[PDB]
């Protein structure tokens, strides 16, 4: 039931990702199925308050990117070590 | 395992002959056949092969798999190998004792002109 | 109770890959057979690998144990 608005990452690597997290976002990827993996940038606060729920890790999510909808499921989250924030999320298609 | 024990007996002389780079006459003794084949120094390709499963050899024998059969095979490999310009090989006994019918095969290959 | 060490033996690879050698040249002075002898390479008494023919040094990985051979290409 969660709708997560995303964009496509035109840049990647550690420079671009650390630039992207200082701007209060974080990178993510949608892989799985037969399609190519999709690099995605996500707003941070929406996803953090959203993942405070338990249903974020169990229910099918919907990610809106370029006006499409990809029904994914949250595979695996890298968190920051000592701060309450996120580094990255793997989303498997569903 | 008997076959695996034989292969690890073979391995030293095999790798030594691949190291020197000599054309090898590989023998193979089975309880009712003997097999003999001349193999190029790259190890992949054969040149000459005779054995007792060939009816050209087997029809003129009483029993495939004794010393008379093996002498027939050694004579055959020496003849065919001299017909194909091969003169000087190195004998790969292939894990068997050089005693019985591999000795008969190799002696028969030395009588009929093959240089080892 | 301490304070001793031996003199450094200067092991290792003396000629690297693609490096042209003369016959007799030591390629890898080493301690066991960390590197094994391949084509046109001999292994000395202290497992020193030396060029037995002229050519180029060829480091390879062969066989069922993934050993590190050293061949020499004729050149």
């Amino acid at each position: 039931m969660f709708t997560i608005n995303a964009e496509v990452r035109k840049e990647q690597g550690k420079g671009a990702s650390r630039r992207l997290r200082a701007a209060n976002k974080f990178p993510a990827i949608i892989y799985g199925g037969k399609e190519a993996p999709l690099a995605i940038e996500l707003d941070h606060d929406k996803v953090m308050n959203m993942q405070a729920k338990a249903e974020f890790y169990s229910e099918v999510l919907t990610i809106v990117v370029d006006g499409k909808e990809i029904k994914v499921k949250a595979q695996d989250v890298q968190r920051h070590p000592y701060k309450p924030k996120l580094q990255h999320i793997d989303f498997v298609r569903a | 395992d008997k076959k695996s024990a034989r292969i690890r007996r073979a391995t030293r002389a095999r790798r030594k002959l691949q190291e020197l780079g000599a054309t090898r006459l590989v023998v193979h003794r089975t309880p009712r056949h003997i097999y003999a084949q001349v193999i190029a120094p790259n190890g992949s390709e054969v040149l000459v092969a005779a054995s007792t499963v060939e009816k050209a050899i087997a029809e003129q024998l009483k029993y495939t798999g004794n010393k008379d059969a093996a002498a027939a095979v050694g004579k055959a490999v020496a003849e065919r190998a001299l017909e194909k310009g091969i003169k000087d090989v190195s004998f790969d006994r292939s894990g068997f004792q050089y005693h019985g019918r591999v000795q008969a095969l190799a002696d028969a290959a030395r009588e009929a002109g093959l240089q080892f | 109770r301490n304070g001793r060490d031996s003199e450094a033996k200067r092991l290792g690879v003396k000629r690297f890959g693609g490096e042209s050698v003369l016959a007799g040249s030591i390629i890898v002075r080493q301690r066991g057979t960390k590197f094994h002898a391949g084509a046109n390479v001999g292994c000395g008494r202290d497992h020193t690998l030396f060029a037995k023919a002229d050519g180029k040094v060829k480091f390879e990985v062969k066989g069922p144990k993934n050993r590190k051979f050293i061949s020499i290409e004729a050149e």
Binding site: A74, D76, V77, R79, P81, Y82 | - | -
Partner: protein, 136 residues
């Protein structure tokens, strides 16, 4: 006090304490006392903090000490010159990086876990925080 039962060598080099930690999630228990500062922790500080916790949430609950010392720290005596060997093994520390869950606790309410972890984080030299068991 915690100390390895049997080492392999008595004296270790200093070395450095860089980068982030490996034990990061609350694994065994339900609430965790996670490091934020770098530092290092002697066995006396781990014991002091564990007694503060065990007292605080009485003999109910279950507490896991997720760090272990296993690093010997040598000191030279007083009025001894420099040189003449490495010192003597005085205590044992664990090296901590930002992210280590130093302790875990289960079988209490969260408000007692806050209370015991406050009581015991004041016996440690590093800045510390409270974490919960997050699900993936």
């Amino acid at each position: 006090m915690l100390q390895p039962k049997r080492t392999k060598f008595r004296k270790m080099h200093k070395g450095r304490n860089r980068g982030l930690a490996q034990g990061t999630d609350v694994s065994f228990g339900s609430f965790g006392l996670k490091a934020v500062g770098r530092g290092r922790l002697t066995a006396r500080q781990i014991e002091a903090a564990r007694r503060a916790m065990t007292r605080a949430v009485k003999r109910q609950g279950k507490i896991w000490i997720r760090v272990f010392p296993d690093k010997p720290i040598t000191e030279k005596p007083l009025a001894v010159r420099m040189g003449k060997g490495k010192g003597n093994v005085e205590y044992w520390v664990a090296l901590i990086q930002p992210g280590k869950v130093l302790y875990e606790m289960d079988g209490v309410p969260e408000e007692l876990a806050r209370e015991a972890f406050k009581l015991a984080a004041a016996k440690l030299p590093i800045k510390t925080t409270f974490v919960t068991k997050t699900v993936m």
